[PDB]
Amino acid sequence: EFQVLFVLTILTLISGTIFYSTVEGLRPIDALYFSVVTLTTVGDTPPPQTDFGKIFTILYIFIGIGLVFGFIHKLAVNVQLPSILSNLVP
């Protein structure tokens, strides 16, 4: 489960990185950062400048938000929770 959501999230972020670096002309790291803060809904960066970028982002949000949060919901409930929960047992 976690591993699958892990791969699915990675692929989604790779696509975004490739897209924004190419179409919005961002350095790969900045393209990855934008992809991440967009799908996690933080949105702390300026928006895309091109219409292609705006259209892709709209679709990217609708298709990727569900996945990204599904992964986060498991990364903290099925991986981070035990490490602390079990450790909370003397």
Residues in contact with a copy of itself, shown as a per-residue x/- string from 34 to 53 under the rule CB under 8 A: --xxx-xxxxxxxx---x--
Whole-angstrom distance, CA of residue 52 vs CA of residue 84: 44
DSSP 4-45: HHHHHHHHHHHHHHHHHHHHS---HHHHHHHHHHHHTT---S
**Is residue 30 at the binding interface for a copy of itself, with CB under 8 A as the rule?**
yes
Q: Give me the residue label for tokens 């047992």.
A: 89
**Is residue 80 at the binding interface for a copy of itself, with CB under 8 A as the rule?**
yes
Least spacing, CB of residue 8 vs a copy of itself, in Å: 7
Count of residues that interact with a copy of itself, criterion CB under 8 A: 38
| Contact positions vs K ion (CB under 5 A) | 41, 43
